[PDB]
Design an enzyme around this catalytic site. Structure first.
Site, PDB file in Angstrom:
ATOM      1  N   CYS A 106       0.816  -1.203   0.000  1.00 54.24           N
ATOM      2  CA  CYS A 106       0.000   0.000   0.000  1.00 54.24           C
ATOM      3  C   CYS A 106       0.853   1.257   0.000  1.00 54.24           C
ATOM      4  O   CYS A 106       0.723   2.097  -0.885  1.00 54.24           O
ATOM      5  CB  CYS A 106      -0.991  -0.014   1.163  1.00 54.24           C
ATOM      6  SG  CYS A 106      -2.482  -1.011   0.846  1.00 54.24           S
ATOM      7  N   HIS A 139      -2.642   0.464   6.989  1.00 56.25           N
ATOM      8  CA  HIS A 139      -2.993   0.629   5.577  1.00 56.25           C
ATOM      9  C   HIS A 139      -2.944   2.083   5.203  1.00 56.25           C
ATOM     10  O   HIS A 139      -3.213   2.962   6.038  1.00 56.25           O
ATOM     11  CB  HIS A 139      -4.430   0.195   5.276  1.00 56.25           C
ATOM     12  CG  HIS A 139      -4.668  -1.280   5.364  1.00 56.25           C
ATOM     13  ND1 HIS A 139      -3.960  -2.194   4.624  1.00 56.25           N
ATOM     14  CD2 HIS A 139      -5.580  -1.984   6.078  1.00 56.25           C
ATOM     15  CE1 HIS A 139      -4.407  -3.415   4.896  1.00 56.25           C
ATOM     16  NE2 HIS A 139      -5.386  -3.310   5.775  1.00 56.25           N
ATOM     17  N   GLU A 184      -5.933   1.632  -3.935  1.00 58.27           N
ATOM     18  CA  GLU A 184      -5.119   0.911  -2.966  1.00 58.27           C
ATOM     19  C   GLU A 184      -4.457  -0.292  -3.605  1.00 58.27           C
ATOM     20  O   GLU A 184      -4.976  -0.857  -4.560  1.00 58.27           O
ATOM     21  CB  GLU A 184      -5.992   0.436  -1.806  1.00 58.27           C
ATOM     22  CG  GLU A 184      -7.196  -0.367  -2.267  1.00 58.27           C
ATOM     23  CD  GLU A 184      -7.917  -1.108  -1.152  1.00 58.27           C
ATOM     24  OE1 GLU A 184      -7.635  -0.887   0.038  1.00 58.27           O
ATOM     25  OE2 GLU A 184      -8.796  -1.929  -1.477  1.00 58.27           O
TER      26      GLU A 184
END
Length: 136
Positions: free
Chosen positions: A47, A96, A108
């Protein structure tokens, strides 16, 4: 502004990696790279890696780790969230990071099928603030 255009550019650049597989520890400034751990065999992006690669495209170097990316610009309240704003998950964004596309969509690296993709924004775990890197 040049700020508005840089963000579109960043988003578009990240968008050009659509489908590139998720790879833990993976990503460079110029594209996907082998990650580490289970990412050792996958030439892709995690990510934070995607985010970094995107911004590198307009010459801004942001940290490797999503937790440090969290503190790499100004903190924005959820209700002022803006296309181009980074979205974080986990305490201090340690879990994340994704790119806010506006409209309740984000970009993402780890979406179902472990690939760079476009998802609806998710609520569980989200850190209180987004982070703005480029102040358009």
């Amino acid at each position: 502004v040049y700020g508005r255009q840089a963000i579109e550019y960043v988003i578009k650049r990240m968008g050009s990696q659509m489908g590139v597989p998720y790879s833990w520890g993976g990503g460079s400034l110029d594209g996907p790279s082998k990650g580490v751990g289970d990412g050792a065999n996958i030439t892709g992006f995690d990510c934070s890696g995607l985010m970094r690669y995107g911004f590198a495209g307009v010459g801004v170097l942001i940290p490797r780790f999503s937790g440090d990316q969290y503190n790499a610009g100004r903190h924005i309240p959820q209700d002022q969230a803006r296309r181009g704003d980074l979205i974080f998950y986990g305490p201090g964004g340690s879990q994340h990071v994704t790119m806010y596309l506006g409209n309740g969509q984000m970009l993402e690296a780890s979406g179902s099928a472990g690939k760079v993709t476009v998802s609806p924004v998710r609520k569980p775990g989200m850190t209180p603030f987004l982070t703005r890197i480029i102040e358009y």
